[PDB]
Amino acid sequence: KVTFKDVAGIEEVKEEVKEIIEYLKDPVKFQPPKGVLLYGEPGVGKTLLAKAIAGEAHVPFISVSGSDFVEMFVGVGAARVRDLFETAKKHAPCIIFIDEIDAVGRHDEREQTLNQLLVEMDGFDTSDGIIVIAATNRPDILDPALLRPGRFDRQIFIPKPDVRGRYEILKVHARNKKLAKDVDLEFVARATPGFTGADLENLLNEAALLAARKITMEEIEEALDRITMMTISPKEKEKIAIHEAGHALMGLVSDDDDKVHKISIIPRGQLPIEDKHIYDKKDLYNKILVLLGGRAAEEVFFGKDGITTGAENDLQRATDLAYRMVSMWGMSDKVGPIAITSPDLLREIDEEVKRIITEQYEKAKAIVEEYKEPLKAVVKKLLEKETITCEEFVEVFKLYGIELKDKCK
């Protein structure tokens, strides 16, 4: 059995999949939902989420793994996919769950089967009554063709749980076991930042050794320390808080930008496809400034000897974008309106890129230097809660006589 109680710490994902649940329950009543792509680190509850979606609508669950499809002989995988959809159509309504989708997605051996999969996605119309759920641990290798309309057009991220999420997951797993009264799961949630649901289940199961010898806090602590011997250290919590806080500050103070999301020491999220948009010079300057917020805050607070690697992913994108401004979009007066080479031109390009990056970085550093005290306050609140809202950020900054731009999603 898999019910709503078995999932915890992701109300947004539940709200997003309620529509698919209604689709599985009553296909007629709706007057699309075709493919749902779940992505996240291993052990975050993707297969659990699929099983829960299946059990909520009270429909069958057809589970399969791509790993056994690919590694076969010519014709095995394509016939396997075809026969799968045959079973699904015969046993309609149901969910077809394909674990490790990106590993298989990545003419040739693997390609023919994936083509069969896409032909199946396109063949079943919305009156067949079926849906397909796919889970992946490595999304960067996925083929963009899988994200086209009518073919896994909807994507969902399963972030790691914060204090509340970890507490709820602990409560969920505890039900089967008869723990002691003295235990305080809240302290456990506050003492295991950066853990996944499977990781915490491993803690509850780990205390099985203590029950074997004798569940009390002694076992929970011994098992958390054993697995640790990867909880996020408090210094790492502070660093991540300052990074996300710089991001939020730059997003809020930008002259013109898009809505800002909820702050959290948990990762923000990737897996790009067609942006299908256009941007101007100032908008790109501002996006760069945003991507440079975390590192600027790090340097301002800890100094030049404190900057961290957490901005890696960030630091890349920013610089990457800068290149697209000079070598692809001709947004440089020095270089000129030329898009694509002799060493002189590459030198000019690099000089302009460094100019842009250093300008925006000095700008971000000055911004942070101006509003250091409310930033410290926000960091304290985020540390105590591990997750705050854009509105709470605005409130903390208003407490210092600083009126920020009112743009929250």
Ligand X SMILES: Nc1ncnc2c1ncn2[C@@H]1O[C@H](COP(=O)(O)OP(=O)(O)O)[C@@H](O)[C@H]1O
296-335 binders of Zn ion (CB under 5 A): 314
What is the Cα–Cα distance from 92 to 107, expressed in whole angstroms? 32
- The region of 7-15, 298-306, 371-379, 394-402 touching its own copies under the rule CB under 8 A is 298-306
- The region of 46-54, 220-228, 241-249, 313-321 touching ligand X under the rule CB under 6 A is 46-54
42 labeled binding residue:
yes
The distance of Cα 117 from the centroid of its chain, to the nearest Å, equals 26
Residue 72 is given by DSSP the state S
Query: 176 is in the binding site of which of ligand X, Zn ion, its own copies, none (Cβ under 5 to 8 A by kind)?
Result: none
Q: Does 158 bind its own copies (CB under 8 A)?
A: no
The answer for 150, left when phi > 0, alpha when psi is -120 to 50, beta otherwise, is: left
129-158 binders of ligand X (CB under 6 A): 135
Query: 159 is in the binding site of which of ligand X, Zn ion, its own copies, none (Cβ under 5 to 8 A by kind)?
Result: none
Residue 137 is given by DSSP the state S
Count other C-beta atoms under 10 Å from residue 78's C-beta.
19
Site size with its own copies, rule: CB under 8 A: 75
What is the Cα–Cα distance from 289 to 283, expressed in whole angstroms? 10
3-state secondary structure of 96: strand
Tell me which of 48, 156, 353, 357 binds ligand X, using CB under 6 A.
48
Binding mask 74-113 for its own copies (x = CB under 8 A): --------------------------x-xx------x---
Site size with ligand X, rule: CB under 6 A: 17
H or E element at residue 99: strand 94-99
What is the Cα–Cα distance from 55 to 46, expressed in whole angstroms? 14
Q: Which of 39, 94, 42, 104 is nearest to 63 (CA)?
A: 94
227-246 binders of ligand X (CB under 6 A): none
Query: 122 is in the binding site of which of its own copies, ligand X, Zn ion, none (Cβ under 5 to 8 A by kind)?
Result: its own copies
Tell me which of 276, 401, 403, 409 binds its own copies, using CB under 8 A.
276
Tell me which of 37, 44, 289, 364 binds ligand X, using CB under 6 A.
44
Tell me which of 45, 129, 159, 374 binds ligand X, using CB under 6 A.
45
Rg (CA), the chain: 25
- The region of 166-174, 217-225, 332-340, 377-385 touching its own copies under the rule CB under 8 A is 332-340
Burial of residue 348 (number of CB atoms within 10 Å: 0-12, 13-18, 19+): middle
Query: 234 is in the binding site of which of Zn ion, ligand X, its own copies, none (Cβ under 5 to 8 A by kind)?
Result: none
Burial of residue 75 (number of CB atoms within 10 Å: 0-12, 13-18, 19+): exposed
CB 404 to Zn ion: min, Å: 20
188-207 binders of ligand X (CB under 6 A): 197-198, 201
What is the Cα–Cα distance from 107 to 392, expressed in whole angstroms? 54
Please tell me which residue in 120, 244, 298, 386 is annotated as part of the active site: 244
Q: Is 244 a catalytic residue?
A: yes
Are the beta carbons of 293 and 393 closer than 8 angstroms? no
Tokens representing 61?
A: 């669950």
3-state secondary structure of 158: coil
Sequence ranges of the binding site for Zn(2+):
243, 247, 314
Catalytic residues: 244
Residues engaged in binding ligand X (CB under 6 A)? 6-9, 42-48, 135, 169, 172, 197-198, 201
Sequence ranges of the binding site:
40-47, 243, 247, 314
